[PDB]
A paper describes a structure:
Phosphotriesterase-like Lactonases (PLLs) are appealing candidates, being natural lactonases endowed with promiscuous phosphotriesterase activity. PTEs and PLLs belong to the amidohydrolase superfamily, and share the same (β/α)8 barrel topology. SsoPox exhibits high acyl-homoserine lactones and oxo-lactones hydrolysis abilities, and promiscuous, low phosphotriesterase activity. SsoPox is a very appealing candidate for the bioremediation of phosphotriesters because of its unique thermal stability, and its ability to resist aging, solvent and protease treatments.
Of them, the most active variants, αsA1 (C258L-I261F-W263A), αsA6 (F46L-C258A-W263M-I280T), αsB5 (V27A-I76T-Y97W-Y99F-L130P-L226V), αsC6 (L72I-Y99F-I122L-L228M-F229S-W263L), and αsD6 (V27A-Y97W-L228M-W263M) were subject to kinetic and structural characterization. The best improved variant, αsD6, exhibits a 2,210-fold increase in catalytic efficiency against methyl-parathion. Interestingly, some selected variants retained a strong preference for oxono-phosphotriesters (~10-fold), whereas others such as αsD6 lost the thiono-effect. Interestingly, the improved variants do not exhibit significant difference in KM values for thiono-phosphotriesters, but show a dramatic increase in kcat values, as compared to wild-type enzymes (e.g. kcat value of 6.89 s−1 and 1.10 × 10−3 s−1, as compared to methyl-parathion for the αsD6 variant and wild-type enzymes, respectively). The two selected variants, namely αsB5 and αsD6, which lost the thiono-effect have only two mutations in common: V27A and Y97W. Both residues are located relatively close to the bi-metallic active site, yet do not interact directly with the metals (V27-Fe: 6.7 Å, Y97-Co: 4.3 Å). While most structures were solved at high or medium resolutions (1.4–2.55 Å), mutant asD6 could only be solved at low resolution (2.95 Å). Given this resolution, we limited our interpretations and retained this data for the consistency of the study as it exhibits structural features (loop 8 disorder) that are consistent with all the other mutants. In the two other mutants, αsD6 and αsB5, loop 8 could not be modeled due to the lack of electronic density, which was likely to be due to the high level of motion of this enzyme region. Given both its catalytic proficiency and high thermal stability (Tm = 82.5 °C), αsD6 is a promising candidate for organophosphorus compound bioremediation and, in particular, the decontamination of water runoffs, soils, food products and materials.
Author numbering:
A (entry chain D): 1 to 259, 272 to 314
B (entry chain A): 1 to 259, 274 to 314
């Protein structure tokens, strides 16, 4: 209909349901695995992904959006292999995940050839299959907006324009790279409301998060559990403030989980065991959290 | 007995034969190929690799060292798939090809763990097979010696210590990164005569090339055909001068070919360099030094 699924017929924007917007089934470095298969376990990765997903479906999750692309080891075979075993709505995307420079393949070649790769996934299929991409993923971090990074950003804009699919981003919360990605995408003609700026839940500075939201774009409070970036209690503190400041129309929650001495209670359900119960406790009607997990993904893919 | 082959029983370090020390049957970037198979052809890629190798065998090539590692899309299944169609002595290796940073899988990692990856390919096997690595490959370029690049270099040393296999490198000729590779490896107890500093045939400055040869390291005149870095006539001009200055014992020639620069093929050396090289006062013994005896003592 509007949103393509992995191993399922496409569905309408409005049937997305309760949705975890940023979760990784598995995530590796293509080169490292292609060259040393002995370091991995196809069966253990598969199980860890199965019982984590179906646990999320028990809690009420209907749709998981997986932003695993090039540089994070996308594999629609493994994705459809785990959808068949769970029945989950898996939205796969396309894009490129880099911090500094991009592969030598792309050395000195056209920013429109990059976007053609995304377009290929969106319209034609992914990795030789009919599974199509529902979004495009881009990244930046400590380096931030390096010449090569910028090309990817800009290539996403093109793909958005040509296919209307939304854009999930990876950013660093402490170095303005999130705002920069928004600027460059808005400047290039991208509906601010089609942009999810991610990982900005790793900071206290609420003013920075608001400026991004005030400018039309979804804010990603999407790393619940990863206490090295921000403790759960401190993330919960913020999210509540942003709700009580009337920003629920642009808040998106997720875990950024990848199926320990400091990865404590990190999992694809930490939100239900702590986060949601904490909100309600501080008076936040099921309307204020259906917005976040149902209506915000609704208008994002609409 | 000494040097492990792809699809063949290990051979003795004295039986290398005529060898091309730096040739790539195929290279790509796993990230792009894993994500977009539609962009490649595992069949045309095979044919190009077949007829190019046997043409080198028809010029008298007995061994081909292939320094395709992580980042360049090493694939022993494709390598052994082309050895059964040619019968060529293919020496595969292990190591990491990067300029700045290495995969996110290598964050707060112990540079020994990096070494252990090489040692695994050397002693155990490559990509779940019994084909073993005969050398370790490292790189550096315009960015130079980054912190992460330096980790790879030092990890190759640890693999050298433990397995005694040689080290082939990729360097930029115009930024002292080759000398730095030798500087670090020697300072980490690496036998200077087990190191091949490559791509230094891309420059005129013979003084730079000598200082690397004078410290015990083989000099890689290994990109014949790639006129974009140096024209063939200017490489030949530069090789000859080094021979007649008594540096034949430390010279290794190759193409760095990947199955402007139009004459670039894996046999360009026989069609131009060799003929030229010996019409200008270069005996057959000294060319055997470069293509047989220098790979000999490199893998010895
Ligand atoms: Co991220
Ligand atoms: Co090279
Ligand atoms: Fe993520
Ligand atoms: Fe090479």
């Amino acid at each position: 209909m509007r949103i393509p699924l992995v191993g399922k017929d496409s569905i309408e924007s409005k049937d997305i349901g309760f949705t975890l917007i940023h979760e990784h089934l598995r995530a590796f470095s293509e080169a490292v695995r292609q060259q040393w298969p002995h370091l991995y376990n196809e069966d253990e990765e598969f199980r860890n992904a199965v019982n984590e997903v179906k646990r999320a479906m028990q809690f009420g999750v209907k749709t998981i959006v997986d932003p695993t692309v090039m540089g994070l080891g996308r594999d629609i075979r493994f994705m459809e292999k785990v959808v068949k075993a769970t029945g989950i709505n898996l939205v796969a995307g396309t894009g490129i995940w880099i911090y500094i420079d991009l592969p030598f393949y792309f050395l000195n070649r056209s920013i429109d050839e990059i976007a053609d790769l995304f377009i290929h996934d969106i319209k034609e299929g992914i990795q030789g299959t009919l599974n199509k991409a529902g979004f495009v993923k881009i990244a930046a971090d400590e380096p931030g907006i390096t010449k090569d990074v910028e090309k990817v950003i800009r290539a996403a804009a093109i793909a958005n324009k040509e296919t209307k699919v939304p854009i999930i981003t990876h950013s660093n919360a402490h170095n303005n790279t999130g705002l920069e990605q928004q600027r460059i995408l808005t400047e290039e003609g991208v509906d601010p409301g089609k942009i999810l700026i991610g990982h900005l839940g790793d900071t206290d500075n609420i003013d920075y998060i608001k400026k991004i939201a005030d400018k039309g774009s979804f804010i990603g409070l999407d790393r619940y559990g990863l206490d090295m970036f921000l403790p759960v209690d401190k993330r919960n503190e913020t999210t509540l403030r942003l709700i009580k400041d009337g920003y629920s129309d642009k808040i998106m929650i997720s875990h950024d989980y990848c199926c320990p001495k400091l990865a404590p209670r990190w999992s694809i359900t930490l939100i239900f065991e702590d986060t949601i119960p904490f909100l309600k406790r501080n008076g936040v009607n099921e309307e204020v959290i259906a917005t976040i997990f149902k209506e915000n993904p609704k208008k994002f893919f609409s």
